[PDB]
């Protein structure tokens, strides 16, 4: 894959008698790729091009 | 995998 | 895949007797690809082009 | 796939005697692709072009 | 993969009788790739190009 | 992979009767790659190009 | 995988 | 893997 | 691996 | 590996 | 594509006051795939899955 | 692509007052794949999965 | 790609008042893959998975 | 790519008032892969996984 | 790439009033991989995984 | 590319 | 590339 | 590249 | 590169 | 590079 910008920009602002609250499960980018073979296999080709 | 965010306020 | 911008931009603003609250399960991008073979296989080709 | 912009932009604003509340299960993009073969297979071709 | 910018920029600002609160599970980028083979395998090719 | 900038820049500012609070599980970049083979294997090729 | 966000307010 | 963020306020 | 951030305020 | 950050305030 | 056998087998036999004569322009298989872009292009995705 | 056998087997036999004659332009298999971009291009993704 | 056998086996036999004659332009397998970019390009991704 | 055998075996036999004659342009296997970039380029990713 | 055998075995036999003649341009295997960049380039990633 | 085989006999 | 085999007999 | 085999007999 | 085999017989 | 084999017989 090819990206032009990949901009991730939060504005987090709370200025009065106020309360701001935030949580992220992995704010960003996960690029995962995985090969695994089962037992007693043969003649196997596994490839991941991202 | 598993991704979670637990958040509370009082 | 090919992207032009990929802009993710939140405006989070709370300024009075106010309460803002937010949560994300993975704000962003997950690019996952996976090959796995079952047991006792043979002559198998597995490939993931993203 | 080919994208021109991919803009995701929330405006989150609450400034008075007010309460704003939000949750996302994966705000963003999931690009997943998966190959798996059953047991005791042979002569199999599996490919995922995104 | 090829990136143009990869900008991740949070604005975190709270200046009054206010309380700001934030947490991240891995703000950033995870580039993971993994090969593993099952037991008693033979003639296996596994490769991950990112 | 090839990057243009890789800028990660937080603005953390709280100057009044205020309290700012933040935590990160690995703010940054994790570039992990792993090869492992199961027991009693033979004729196996495993390679990870990032 | 499984992705979740639990959030409460009082 | 598993990624989580537990956060509370009172 | 597993990545977590536990944070509380009172 | 496992990465964590425990933080509290009172 | 997935093949079962791909057998190419010529019988070439001439045993008397005889003359056998043969020529091939690439006896076999050519699996070619090609991406090219014209000048001054942008925002283009080109992929060939065989 | 995935192959079962890929057998290429010629029988070439001439035993009398005889003359056998043969030529090949690349007897076998050519697996070629090529990416090229024109001048002054930008935001281009080119990938060939075989 | 994944192969089962890849057997290339010629029988070349001429035993009498006989003449056998043969030529090959690359008997075998050519696995070629090539990336090239034109001048003054930017933001380009080129990858060849075989 | 993953191979099962890769057997290349010629039988070359001429025992009488006979003449056998043979030539090969690279009998075997050529596994070539090449990256090159044009002049004045920037932000380019080029990778060849075989 | 992963190979099972890679057997290349010629039988060359001529025992009578006979003449056997043979030539090879590189009987064997050429595993070549090459990265080169054009002049005045910047921000370039080039890698060849075989 | 271009592939050719020129062969003659007399 | 270009691949050729020139062969003659007399 | 270019691959060729020139062969003659008389 | 370029690979060639020139062979003659008389 | 360039690889060649020149061979003659009379």
UniProtKB/Swiss-Prot annotation, chains A, C, D, E, F, K, L, M, N, O:
Region (Disordered): 31-50
Compositionally skewed regions (Low complexity) per UniProt: 32-48
UniProt effect for mutating residue 21 to K: In ALS10; triggers mitochondrial DNA release into the cytosol, which is then detected by CGAS, leading to activation of the cGAS-STING pathway and autoinflammation; impedes the development of normal limb and tail buds and increases the number of apoptotic nuclei when expressed in chick embryos; does not affect the interaction with ATXN2
UniProt modification remark: Hyperphosphorylated in hippocampus, neocortex, and spinal cord from individuals affected with ALS and FTLDU. Phosphorylated upon cellular stress. Ubiquitinated in hippocampus, neocortex, and spinal cord from individuals affected with ALS and FTLDU.
Tissue spec. comment: Ubiquitously expressed. In particular, expression is high in pancreas, placenta, lung, genital tract and spleen.
Superkingdom of origin: Eukaryota
UniProt-annotated location(s): Nucleus; Cytoplasm; Cytoplasm, Stress granule; Mitochondrion
Disease: Amyotrophic lateral sclerosis 10: A neurodegenerative disorder affecting upper motor neurons in the brain and lower motor neurons in the brain stem and spinal cord, resulting in fatal paralysis. Sensory abnormalities are absent. The pathologic hallmarks of the disease include pallor of the corticospinal tract due to loss of motor neurons, presence of ubiquitin-positive inclusions within surviving motor neurons, and deposition of pathologic aggregates. The etiology of amyotrophic lateral sclerosis is likely to be multifactorial, involving both genetic and environmental factors.
Subunit composition and interactions: Homodimer. Homooligomer (via its N-terminal domain). Interacts with BRDT. Binds specifically to pyrimidine-rich motifs of TAR DNA and to single stranded TG repeated sequences. Binds to RNA, specifically to UG repeated sequences with a minimum of six contiguous repeats. Interacts with ATXN2; the interaction is RNA-dependent. Interacts with MATR3. Interacts with UBQLN2. Interacts with HNRNPA2B1. Interacts with ZNF106. Interacts with CNOT7/CAF1. Interacts with CRY2.
Domain notes: Consists of an N-terminal domain (NTD) and two tandem RNA recognition motifs, RRM1 and RRM2, followed by a C-terminal glycine-rich region. Contains a nuclear localization sequence and is mostly nuclear; however, its nuclear export sequence permits it to transport mRNAs to the cytoplasm and even to synapses as part of neuronal granules.
Function: RNA-binding protein that is involved in various steps of RNA biogenesis and processing. Preferentially binds, via its two RNA recognition motifs RRM1 and RRM2, to GU-repeats on RNA molecules predominantly localized within long introns and in the 3'UTR of mRNAs. In turn, regulates the splicing of many non-coding and protein-coding RNAs including proteins involved in neuronal survival, as well as mRNAs that encode proteins relevant for neurodegenerative diseases. Plays a role in maintaining mitochondrial homeostasis by regulating the processing of mitochondrial transcripts.
Protein name: TAR DNA-binding protein 43
Organism phylogeny: Eukaryota, Metazoa, Chordata, Craniata, Vertebrata
Name of the gene encoding the protein in the UniProt record: TARDBP
């Amino acid at each position: 894959m090819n990206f032009g910008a990949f901009s991730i920009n939060p504005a987090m602002m709370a200025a009065a008698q106020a309360a701001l609250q935030s949580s992220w499960g992995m704010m960003g980018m996960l690029a995962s790729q995985q090969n695994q073979s089962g037992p007693s296999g043969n003649n196997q080709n596994q490839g991941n091009m991202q | 995998g598993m991704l979670a965010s637990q958040q509370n306020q009082s």
